[PDB]
């Protein structure tokens, strides 16, 4: 996160760290949707142009964390993955269209004050909250600057932006499975996701049932916090059926 703040303890209890066994290294963010399921960006596991192709074995999931680097002794839970699932029409060749993956935990995790699942949006929740101008929240342990590393989980609040402005900011071809977020240069308030934040959650709080819902997944951007540039996120609602599907077919 660039221009964010230190999260409060237990502020984002669904936040997960994607962790490389060796070398030990933060791969990305992810989120807990149940005691056995984690949701992240497919570009965190599979990215051929860069020979990236992580398997079950290559990673560890860390839940309940505050500090980036410290082993949070009776707070955090470290788990093994049973299986990875990538959306079959995920487009790594051109625009990261359908940038979403599911991670099935080897064993269910126990909720606590620091570990709690976020809600998946319903059509109605989506419809009412996904509006240009409405602000969502991004959290992560990624870079503080485009070009460093925080000590604690950072948070930033950003407004959803109008599709056209989204479209007009890049040479990349935007799809209906994406949304962009950020402040406009004239707005003079800044912030953004940065390196290492990827695969983390973009969440919103319903003013109706006052529950936290994950609307997006931190997907891609051009630099971090650049003027006239925006962050791009996976539209979680549009890919719900695929999510229900794999859980109904293979899990919890």
């Amino acid at each position: 996160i660039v221009e964010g703040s230190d999260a409060e303890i237990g502020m984002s209890p669904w936040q997960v760290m994607l962790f490389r066994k060796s070398p030990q290294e933060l791969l990305c963010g992810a989120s807990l949707i149940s005691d056995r399921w984690v949701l992240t960006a497919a570009h965190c596991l599979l990215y051929p142009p860069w020979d990236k192709n992580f398997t079950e074995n290559d990673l560890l999931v860390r839940i309940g964390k505050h500090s980036r680097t410290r082993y949070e002794r009776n707070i955090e839970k470290i788990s093994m993955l049973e299986k990875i699932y990538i959306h079959p029409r995920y487009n790594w060749r051109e625009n990261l269209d359908r940038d979403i993956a599911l991670m099935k935990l080897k064993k269910p995790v126990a909720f606590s004050d620091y570990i709690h699942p976020v809600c998946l949006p319903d059509r109605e929740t989506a419809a009412s909250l996904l509006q240009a101008g409405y602000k969502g929240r991004v959290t992560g342990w990624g870079n503080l600057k485009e070009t460093g590393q925080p000590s604690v989980l950072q948070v930033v609040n950003l407004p959803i932006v109008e599709r056209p402005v989204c479209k007009d900011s890049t040479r990349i071809r935007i799809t209906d499975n994406m949304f962009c977020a950020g402040y406009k240069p004239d707005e003079g308030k800044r912030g953004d996701a940065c390196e290492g934040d990827s695969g983390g959650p973009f969440v919103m709080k319903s003013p109706f049932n006052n529950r936290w819902y994950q609307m997006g997944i931190v997907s891609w951007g051009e630099g971090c916090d650049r003027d006239g540039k925006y962050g791009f996120y996976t539209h979680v609602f549009r890919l719900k059926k695929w999510i229900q599907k794999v859980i109904d077919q293979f899990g919890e």
């Binding site: 237990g10 004050d113 976020v118 809600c119 101008g133 929240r137 709080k205 003013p207 529950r211 936290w212």
Partner: peptide, 26 residues
């Protein structure tokens, strides 16, 4: 079932330092 209700904030009726910025955008 209990999703999105935070043990240290929602569950005790405490609010985080910037959540008001969100609700106010709506």
């Amino acid at each position: 079932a209990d999703c999105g209700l935070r043990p240290l904030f929602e569950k005790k009726s405490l609010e985080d330092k910037t959540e008001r910025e969100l609700l106010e955008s709506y």
